[PDB]
């Protein structure tokens, strides 16, 4: 009787994903993850302790964020002992923040949090940020309270005025002030103050936070942006780099001012212009071109085919596991459905079918 429970669970899951929309979603991102390292995360209540798992999950989050969206800079400020401590400036290299987080590994989480100080200096760090960049902050929190020097509502008003959004991933339960932050910052939405139920749910939440977010019509910033593809050289001689001032065998060359750099996707240090590859911009095209869900045909009706169109395996036989791409009119197995919907980003049935 487990298949009926699985079916009704899949129905209640798919009721949320019935509506799939091609919203304009931010690509030039600006993501900040502040960390609290206080007495609360010293609890071993989840194995091994909250501090260790948020360290590991932040490592994964950095990797996933830079993989999916390499067109953003990442800054991390830790919270400790009534002080918020900047440990990671916004940068194109994830490895810097990886090393900073590795430093955060060995140190000891202790103290009390101050979202006022944390968000204030996060605002100040987010101040010299260009218009197209979408300023947004992830906040992790384990306390049920917050010691603060002054008002939080002035900070809330300033953050709303400066067009920065937040998303809170609280640990224990809901905190009303964090709900207020999420609602007021997020145009009244309640889809940003999220509480886990276990570590797997925390993993899923982090994966959810990886994704780009849609933007609002009223928050209109539709413009152009100057861009430059550089050229890579492979020279015999080591050559001084502009950024780190040291001898480099290879390195890309600046398209505009003909200097050289060491890493991409990065902006020029000399002509001060952003340099990318077409792979980097095409990386988010699945977000730009979403994929429709695939429908299982019912077991009662007559079937177009009895084996999987894509992976080429036999469909198993009570119910019918034939997920149909209505855009290509072909049914598929669950494994192929998962792979095409998540790993792949094209429908080979729609590739074979001519338009």
């Amino acid at each position: 009787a487990s298949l009926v429970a699985s079916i009704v669970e899949a129905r209640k899951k798919r009721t949320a994903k019935k509506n799939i929309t091609p919203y304009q979603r931010g690509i030039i991102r600006s993501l900040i993850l502040t960390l609290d390292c206080s007495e609360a995360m010293l609890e071993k209540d989840l194995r091994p302790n909250r501090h260790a798992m948020i360290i590991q999950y932040a490592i994964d989050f950095v990797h996933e964020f830079f993989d999916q969206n390499p067109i953003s800079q990442m800054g991390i400020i830790i919270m400790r002992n009534g002080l918020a401590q900047l440990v990671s400036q916004v940068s194109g290299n994830p490895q810097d923040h990886i090393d900073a987080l590795k430093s955060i590994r060995k140190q000891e989480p202790k103290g009390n949090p101050s979202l006022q100080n944390a968000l204030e200096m996060a605002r100040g760090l987010l101040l010299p940020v260009p218009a197209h960049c979408t300023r947004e902050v992830l906040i992790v929190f384990g306390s049920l309270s917050t010691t603060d020097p002054g008002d939080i509502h002035q900070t809330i008003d300033s953050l709303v005025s400066e067009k920065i959004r937040v998303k809170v991933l609280g640990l224990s339960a809901q905190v009303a002030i964090c709900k207020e932050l999420c609602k007021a910052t997020n145009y009244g939405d309640e889809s940003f103050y999220k509480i886990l139920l276990d570590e797997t749910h925390l993993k899923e939440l982090f994966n959810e936070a990886v994704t780009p977010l849609p933007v609002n019509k009223i928050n209109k910033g539709f413009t152009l942006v100057k861009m430059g593809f550089p050229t890579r050289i492979f020279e015999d001689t080591p050559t001084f780099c502009s950024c780190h001032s040291k001898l480099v065998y290879g390195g890309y060359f600046c398209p505009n001012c003909h200097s050289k750099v060491c890493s991409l996707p990065t902006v020029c240090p000399c002509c001060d212009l952003m340099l990318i590859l077409s792979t980097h911009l095409a990386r988010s095209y699945h977000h730009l071109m979403p994929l429709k869900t695939f429908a299982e045909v019912p077991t009662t009706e007559k079937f177009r085919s009895e084996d999987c169109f894509s992976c080429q395996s036999r469909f198993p036989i009570l119910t019918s596991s034939r997920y149909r791409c209505e855009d290509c009119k072909q049914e598929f197995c669950v494994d192929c459905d998962v792979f095409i919907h998540e790993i792949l980003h094209n429908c080979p049935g729609c590739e074979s079918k001519p338009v």
Binding site: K44, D45, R47, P48
Partner: protein, 608 residues
Amino acid sequence: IPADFVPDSVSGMFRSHDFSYLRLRPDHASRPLWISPSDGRIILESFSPLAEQAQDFLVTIAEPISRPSHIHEYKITAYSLYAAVSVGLETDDIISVLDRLSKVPVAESIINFIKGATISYGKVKLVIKHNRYFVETTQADILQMLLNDSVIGVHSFEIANESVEVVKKRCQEIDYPVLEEYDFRNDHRNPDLDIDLKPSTQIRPYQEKSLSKMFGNGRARSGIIVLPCGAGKTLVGITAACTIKKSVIVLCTSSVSVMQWRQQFLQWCTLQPENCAVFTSDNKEMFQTESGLVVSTYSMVANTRNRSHDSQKVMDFLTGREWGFIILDEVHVVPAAMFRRVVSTIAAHAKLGLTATLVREDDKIGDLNFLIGPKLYEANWMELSQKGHIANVQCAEVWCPMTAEFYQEYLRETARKRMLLYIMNPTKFQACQFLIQYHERRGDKIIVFSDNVYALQEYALKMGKPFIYGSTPQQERMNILQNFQYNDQINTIFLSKVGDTSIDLPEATCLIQISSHYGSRRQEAQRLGRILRAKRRNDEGFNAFFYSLVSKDTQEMYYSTKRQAFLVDQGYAFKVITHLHGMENIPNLAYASPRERRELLQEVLLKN
């Protein structure tokens, strides 16, 4: 054998052990039970269904031989089947449930064994009417056969109190066992004691199971209840007394235990300190109330060498009182010859036995069947360890490499002094010093156990922290105990056979053994139970630490193996450590220089 069972070429060492002649049921996936008919053993899976329902049934009708995490080795015994039918169970139901949950066909010998181990339950009973052991059986059919027996010499007749133990052994021998289920509600000949279960006491589930197994009919079934260290046996006895509401006497084998159980009893039951009169050489007062209690250890009833007249008056008073309930806490010592006068002296109806270990060197532990009765309940030790009712220990057995400095004299020493000569190794002193350093570095209270007072005091003096043994007076030992508990000057202490058992010292999560008995497993088991009742047995990431410094190149390895094998079979393993940690990182080592080693060698040569 449900087969021809032609002997296989690989069954040669399987001396009737190749158990593949059985026709395994296709329901072997669901059913958790095998039967081993060669030795009566039972093989039980810990990963197949019906085991949760069958666990209590297998405890009731069978004894476990070994219970690791994967496969429980049980064994049906006639003792366990008598315990089953005493709880209230029968052969046919046992056979039916066994075939219901058994992967294998039920063996003929096991069927016959359970058929034989069915008692005349209810036929043979005894009651006390005004301190008189009246053998009240339901029929004269019992009277005919019992008078047919030559030992004896509805209807009730007298058997003398010392003759009661002998005739109970005899009727167990002729398999006509007596049940002692007091109708304390129906009997009002004894003075009822107005003691109530306070709402401040609420009972653990396994303790409720222990009560209801011996309170199935509402009467108090008499026997043994074996519970681990710190399980709440005092709470179980308090609950039994409060639901019996009669005159009750409980004896434990320490005056410290007398003090602690008296305060426990006046704490968690509504009996009054007036009703409780404590008997010892401190004071021999009596309560004058119709109902109440008098507590003493077993010594003030056993002894007749140096007795006071007030002691004589008190033992006369307790002889006069016809009690309704008796509990012999730490029941492992009462079947000793100077201690088994309990039936001969005390007139008490219900006989319950609460202890941690149900093992000893000889077979006096089975005498409790005809002294107090069978085991009414036991709690599974690893189940309570995972439940947090008892602790989880990372025991680390330290194989100290033997120094030739002491071995050269140890080999030529005479036998009575070889022991004290190989206890005192300078390498062992070095290892103990760094271990104390390392666990005070970890911040653990450490208790050191030595079997010899001189070794205990030498280790204590080399530490610079005091010692407690059996010859130390009570006032000095409690002063040292409170100094250890509260004073930070006394970080560790040096305990002995007054610390091995019958005390409440659970703070020491770290324990280092430098010496022990020759082969007494119960002393080592009680030493393990000293830290098994530790307070932080419930917090996450906890593992208690047990250490045994044993000299190599001796028989002490086999001695420690013998002393530890019960705990290993329980589930408390003894891991191998020979090359220790931090052996030279410690700067100062006790008797490190060879001149210091020869110094201590000739110092102990002064005695050996």
